[PDB]
Amino acid sequence: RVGQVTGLAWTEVGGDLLTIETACVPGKGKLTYTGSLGEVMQESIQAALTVVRARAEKLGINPDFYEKRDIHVHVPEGATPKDGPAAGIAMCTALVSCLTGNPVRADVAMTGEITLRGQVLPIGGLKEKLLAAHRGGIKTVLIPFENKRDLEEIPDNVIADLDIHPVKRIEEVLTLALQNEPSGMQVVTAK
Amino acid sequence: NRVGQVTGLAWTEVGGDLLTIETACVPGKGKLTYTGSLGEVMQESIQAALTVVRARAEKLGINPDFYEKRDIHVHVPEGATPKDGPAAGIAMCTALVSCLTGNPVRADVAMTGEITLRGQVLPIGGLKEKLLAAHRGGIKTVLIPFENKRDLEEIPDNVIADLDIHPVKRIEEVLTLALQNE
Amino acid sequence: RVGQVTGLAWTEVGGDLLTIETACVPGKGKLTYTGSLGEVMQESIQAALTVVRARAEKLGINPDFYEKRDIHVHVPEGATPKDGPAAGIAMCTALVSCLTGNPVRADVAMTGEITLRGQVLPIGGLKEKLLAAHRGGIKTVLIPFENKRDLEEIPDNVIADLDIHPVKRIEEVLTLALQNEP
Amino acid sequence: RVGQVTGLAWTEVGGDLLTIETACVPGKGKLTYTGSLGEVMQESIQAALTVVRARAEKLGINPDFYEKRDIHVHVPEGATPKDGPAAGIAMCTALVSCLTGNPVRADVAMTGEITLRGQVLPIGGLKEKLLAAHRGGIKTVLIPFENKRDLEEIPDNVIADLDIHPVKRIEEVLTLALQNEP
Amino acid sequence: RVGQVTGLAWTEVGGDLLTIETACVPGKGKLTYTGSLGEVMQESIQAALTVVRARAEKLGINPDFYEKRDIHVHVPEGATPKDGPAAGIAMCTALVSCLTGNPVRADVAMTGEITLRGQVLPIGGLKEKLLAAHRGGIKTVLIPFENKRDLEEIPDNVIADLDIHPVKRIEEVLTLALQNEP
Amino acid sequence: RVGQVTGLAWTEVGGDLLTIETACVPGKGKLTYTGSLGEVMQESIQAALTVVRARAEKLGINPDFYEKRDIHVHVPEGATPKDGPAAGIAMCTALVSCLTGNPVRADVAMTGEITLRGQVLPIGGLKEKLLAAHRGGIKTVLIPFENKRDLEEIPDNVIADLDIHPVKRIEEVLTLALQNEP
């Protein structure tokens, strides 16, 4: 569905998968985030939104339109403490979706810290995060290009059930996770 | 008369029981206020509840830009009782709808459950005492999270008999079921 | 401006007689409250204003009074800590009075927790509260309908001197407390 | 001394005299309070300001100053902690003088809690306050009418050179402290 | 665009030579202050501005400048805790110098607490402040007039090398500290 | 490449090679900074911003960008704590680059406290700072002029490797770090 993304980050309850939720209603341009989130995860949300605001042009998001919307990012399991930077790209994917009405591919999950430059930084506890995705029955799990080496210590079986896609840019995260090509118009050529 | 009210079942420092969720929606400028010795999780569930309504304003027959000149005060009575949790979520959501549409809530219904921005109802803990409270309170029908159905076998024989429980999964049900004209 | 009401609420030195003052001066819609007020008493002031807000028209008050009015609620004995919800109905009576010019009766005191729906809720320490009103020469006291059971424990002489009215809703409170129409 | 008043209010190093300062410069209506002020003393300033606002009309003050002027209340001895409500009437006097250009009389000091209704309430530690007025070279001292009984246990010599005026209302204070016709 | 004054005040390292900076670029009138400042020192900044604002035109400063200007006061060595009211006269001197373009002399250092009326109040730790100005090779030092006796405790070799000016009011410091006569 | 500057500052773990990021998208003048930054570092960002504002026209920047843009300064490693004023010049640089579009040299690292006057103050832990730049792969490192003495206590192996540029003012920092000419 739109605005809904499955992230993998640390939670009081160990640190499994997250059901990040966002809503883009008519407002003044205010940003709200809830779900028993720690400071680090909160700042990851603020960064994620700047990454979207600073790419609104190629994302189709109109600046005027934006200043007329209130954004609320909620991470259900409201009583569950959650923290860390790992939901970075998921937060960014959820916002893009919300402001563009573009659905989030099903059975897709993602983990990784996002920078302002759009870079996807490696996270910790990939093992736990993949096992959580496994048990959740997820299909496609996007991970930071820099955690590739961590896969090695992950049970082949688990690895067998996951369609792991290492990324390094949020541009890739968006293309894989979203349905409608998030960036620019499609040009078709022929040899 | 610009204020909805719905009986909810949520956690209180004096055992999670029966509460009257109140919501006023008066001439303002888009200000959200919430009182009632509310814990943080409960405070946040009030924010989730309001967003759900704002995302379906037109869908529910409410001015899509109603929030521009409308102030909203969410209070949960007996202001001295320390209370918390996401279980009053759907109740807060219903109250908001009632306040904004002028559509009255059935006084003989009670509800408990965590609400999601997508409108789904999540399961809650301490289901026994919640219903036990609705029973002691004299509630005819109670809405509960579909996921809490397995929770009903641990519910006392007389209360499950005394009460008309209706497991729900979404907020659409809750609203048609709880509103007097919906 | 500056409407006054004798409320009976909890102060650091137990239940006591309080003089609630409310200033409603020309402004921008800011609510200020002072007098060493605890968090719960602060929330009852907020609940009390949201109640006249939601009922401004029926009270003959301009529906957009808050848009250009500033409210200062001050409870004298500035150093004395106070808290609790028992002053709610009196805050609502003070606000109503300030905004409509209708003066508050003398020899009248009230105690009761206010809800957004306008229902008056039972408070505690009624004995200590009524003794205070008695020692202060109060003629008429307003208590919540559900505090009638607590009357049995009050000395007969105190009961005999005081003209006690158990009220259910805020409308009764204003009718009995305001010396004019409302 | 326009906007400068000598108030007798508690401080960490004792209940001596304080020189209240006020600046009401053109701005957008923001009120600043400084001088290591306690919460209670800070609220006494808000109380006093409201009093002036409610009577701006009768006090020859543009009852629209609230949004056109910036007010800064400072109490020198910057690092010295100060608190309590005993400086309330001095704050009000200080403010009125600032908004009207009406200077305050020399050799005058005042102590007393202020209410929004303009009533002057009794204060504590009178013995130390008046002692600080003596050494301060103060001629006239205004005190809460209800601190009159305190004058008894006060040394003859201290009283001796003091023109103590126990007042009941803020009007008495303005007329007694200000130089020009209030 | 940026005023700079060498003041003397208390730092985590003790009374030291401080460079008080002040930017006054275009804005809407927001006051910002940084440099690990304690509350007392922050309040002295607020007091120092109000003084300039209150003497705007006399100081040759376009009144209503605070309507189109932003002010940021920063005291370098951002990691070093700093506090006290002793840099007040210097804060006022950096502002005046910032808003008028009148340069401040580098061979001048000052210490003193500033009141709204413009009086300079005595400060503490005169010894370590003056010992610091000497080490830093400062030739002229402004100290509060009430601090003169204190000089008798500081060693004569240090004081003999310093051209010290005790000051009672802010005009004096602006006259002695500002390169070009204001 | 623009809005990204390599800096050397204190960090809990130890990797002093920080990558300061800045976004200056269209907004209404909102200042925000994240990355687990301590207070001194947050303030250093504040002084850096004011430095830019002061030299706006000189840098060819619109003198009213502060009200037409939203500034977000992030320092990747969201979880890693960072503090100190040593990233001040990196902040100013990243900031100037963002508002002008002028790319930043990827081979230049910098450390140093910045002041409003634009001067670069010495910093601490220079050995660890440079060692970080060494391994990290930086070829040019800008440092405070006054830190020149600290080099002698750092192995030749590392410094012989670096193109150390001691600086006194922000101008030389900008001309040296920005790709083009400020």
What are the angstrom distances between the C-alpha of B22 and each of A133, B48, C63, C87, C168?
40, 16, 20, 19, 17
3-state secondary structure of A167: strand
Which tokens is B129 given? 């005492």
Q: Which chain A residues contact residue B45 at CB under 8 A?
A: 78
Dihedral sign computed on CA atoms, order F91, F97, F98, F104: negative
Give the span between the Cα atoms of B47 and B34, in whole angstroms.
9
Q: Name residue C141's beta-bridge partners.
A: C109, C164
Q: What angle, rounded to 10 degrees, do the helices at A39-53 and A88-100 form?
A: 50
What are the angstrom distances between the C-alpha of E132 and each of A11, A66, E80, E126?
53, 55, 16, 10
Task: Tell me the nearest-neighbour CA distance from C156 into chain D, angstroms.
Answer: 33
Q: Which chain E residues contact residue F56 at CB under 8 A?
A: 25
| Residue E115 to residue D25, Cβ atoms within 8 A | no
Instruction: Please name the member of A21, A36, A70 whose beta carbon is closest to the beta carbon of B118.
Output: A21
Q: Which residues contact C152 (CB under 8 A, 6 or more apart)?
A: none
Give the span between the Cα atoms of B96 and F62, in whole angstroms.
46
Q: Which chain B residues contact residue A81 at CB under 8 A?
A: none
Give the span between the Cα atoms of C86 and C14, in whole angstroms.
12
Give the span between the Cα atoms of D164 and D161, in whole angstroms.
9
Instruction: Please name the member of E47, E66, E117 whose beta carbon is closest to the beta carbon of D34.
Output: E47
Q: Which of F77, F78, F74, F55 is nearest to F66 (CA)?
A: F55
Give φ, ψ of E115 to 5 degrees.
-105, 170
3-state secondary structure of C94: helix
Q: What angle do CA F125, F128, F134 make, to 5 degrees?
A: 140
| Residue A44 to residue F78, Cβ atoms within 8 A | yes
> Which numeric CATH code is attached to B1-180?
3.30.230.10
Task: Tell me the nearest-neighbour CA distance from E86 into chain D, angstroms.
Answer: 9
Q: Name residue B5's beta-bridge partners.
A: B22
Give the span between the Cα atoms of B113 and A184, in whole angstroms.
42
Resolution (A): 2.1
| Alpha helices in E55-169, H assignment, sequence order | 88-100, 126-135, 156-160
Instruction: Please name the member of A1, A26, A79 whose beta carbon is closest to the beta carbon of B118.
Output: A1
Q: 10 Å Cβ neighbour count for C80?
A: 16
Q: Which residues contact D155 (CB under 8 A, 6 or more apart)?
A: none
Q: 10 Å Cβ neighbour count for C167?
A: 21
Return the DSSP state at C105. Answer: P
3-state secondary structure of B27: strand
3-state secondary structure of A126: helix
Q: What is the dihedral of CA C154, C155, C160, C166, to 10 degrees?
A: 0
3-state secondary structure of B49: helix
Q: Which of E175, E115, E118 is nearest to E142 (CA)?
A: E175
Report chain A residues touching chain F, CB-CB < 8 A.
39-40, 43-44, 46-47, 50-51, 53-54, 56, 63, 84-85, 88, 113, 115-117, 119, 121
Give the span between the Cα atoms of F108 and F155, in whole angstroms.
20
With 0-12 / 13-18 / 19 or more C-beta atoms within 10 angstroms meaning exposed / middle / buried, residue F122 is middle
What is the helix (H) or strand (E) element at residue E68, kind and residue range? none
3-state secondary structure of C39: helix
Q: Name residue C33's beta-bridge partners.
A: C73
| Residue A35 to residue B44, Cβ atoms within 8 A | yes
The yes-or-no reply on B/A contact (3 CB pairs or more, < 8 Å) is yes
Q: Name residue D18's beta-bridge partners.
A: D7
The yes-or-no reply on F/B contact (3 CB pairs or more, < 8 Å) is no
Question: CB–CB of C111/C93 below 8 Å?
Answer: no
Return the DSSP state at E153. Answer: T
Task: Tell me the nearest-neighbour CA distance from D99 into chain C, angstroms.
Answer: 17
Chain pair D-E, CB pairs under 8 angstroms: 59
Give the span between the Cα atoms of B20 and F62, in whole angstroms.
55
Instruction: Identify residue B152 by its one-letter amino acid code.
Output: L
Method of elucidation: X-ray
Instruction: Please name the member of B40, B51, B86 whose beta carbon is closest to the beta carbon of A72.
Output: B51
Question: CB–CB of E142/E176 below 8 Å?
Answer: yes
Give φ, ψ of C82 to 5 degrees.
-145, 160
Give the span between the Cα atoms of F13 and E61, in whole angstroms.
50
Q: What is the dihedral of CA F172, F176, F180, F182, to 10 degrees?
A: -20
Give φ, ψ of D21 to 5 degrees.
-120, 150
Q: Give the DSSP per-residue string, chain D.
A: -TT-EEEE--BTTBS-EEEEEEEEEESSS-EEEESSB-HHHHHHHHHHHHHHHHTTTTTTS-TTGGGTEEEEEE-SSTTS-B-SSTTHHHHHHHHHHHHH--PBPTTEEE--EE-TTSBEE--S-HHHHHHHHHHTT-SEEEEEGGGTGGGTTS-HHHHHT-EEEEESBHHHHHHHHBSS--
Question: CB–CB of E134/E102 below 8 Å?
Answer: no
What are the angstrom distances between the C-alpha of D138 and each of A100, D106, D134, D145, D152?
73, 8, 6, 19, 20
| Residue E72 to residue F50, Cβ atoms within 8 A | yes
- R_g (Cα) of chain D, nearest Å: 15
| Residue D66 to residue C4, Cβ atoms within 8 A | no
3-state secondary structure of E113: strand
Q: Which of D78, B98, C87, F68 is nearest to E85 (CA)?
A: D78
List the single best residue of B68, B93, B117, B147 to mutate versus A (max A Cβ within 10 A): B117
Return the DSSP state at B162. Answer: H
The yes-or-no reply on D/F contact (3 CB pairs or more, < 8 Å) is no
Give the span between the Cα atoms of D67 and C26, in whole angstroms.
10
Q: Give the DSSP per-residue string, chain F.
A: -TTEEEEE-EESSS--EEEEEEE--B-SS-EEEESSB-HHHHHHHHHHHHHHHHTTGGGT--TTGGGTB-EEEE-S-TTS-EESSTTHHHHHHHHHHHHH---B-TTEEE--EE-TTSBEE--S-HHHHHHHHHHHT-SEEEEEGGGHHHHTTS-HHHHTTSEEEEESBHHHHHHHHBSS--
Q: 10 Å Cβ neighbour count for C111?
A: 34
Q: Give the DSSP per-residue string, A30-46.
A: -EEEESSB-HHHHHHHH
List the single best residue of F114, F116, F117, F121 to mutate versus E (max E Cβ within 10 A): F116
* Length of chain D, in residues: 182
Domain C1-179 coded CATH 3.30.230.10: yes
What are the angstrom distances between the C-alpha of D30 and each of A29, D19, D69, E117?
26, 22, 7, 20
Question: CB–CB of A174/A142 below 8 Å?
Answer: no
Distance from the Cα of residue C111 to its chain's centroid:
7
Give the span between the Cα atoms of F95 and D56, in whole angstroms.
48
Instruction: Identify residue E163 by its one-letter amino acid code.
Output: D
Question: CB–CB of C140/C119 below 8 Å?
Answer: no
What is the helix (H) or strand (E) element at residue C52, kind and residue range? helix C39-54
- R_g (Cα) of chain E, nearest Å: 15
Report chain B residues touching chain C, CB-CB < 8 A.
1-3, 5, 20, 22-24, 26-28, 33, 35-37, 71, 73, 75, 77-80
Q: Quick one: closest CA in E to D19, which residue? A: E115
Dihedral sign computed on CA atoms, order A109, A110, A116, A118: negative
Q: Which residues contact A119 (CB under 8 A, 6 or more apart)?
A: A168, A169, A170, F76
Give the span between the Cα atoms of F138 and F147, in whole angstroms.
19
With 0-12 / 13-18 / 19 or more C-beta atoms within 10 angstroms meaning exposed / middle / buried, residue F31 is middle
Return the DSSP state at E145. Answer: G
Q: Which chain A residues contact residue F101 at CB under 8 A?
A: none
Q: What angle do CA B90, B92, B96 make, to 5 degrees?
A: 115
Q: 10 Å Cβ neighbour count for B146?
A: 16
Question: CB–CB of A94/A3 below 8 Å?
Answer: yes
Q: Which of C7, C4, C3, C2 is nearest to C114 (CA)?
A: C7
| Alpha helices in A72-144, H assignment, sequence order | 88-100, 126-135
Q: 10 Å Cβ neighbour count for A123?
A: 25
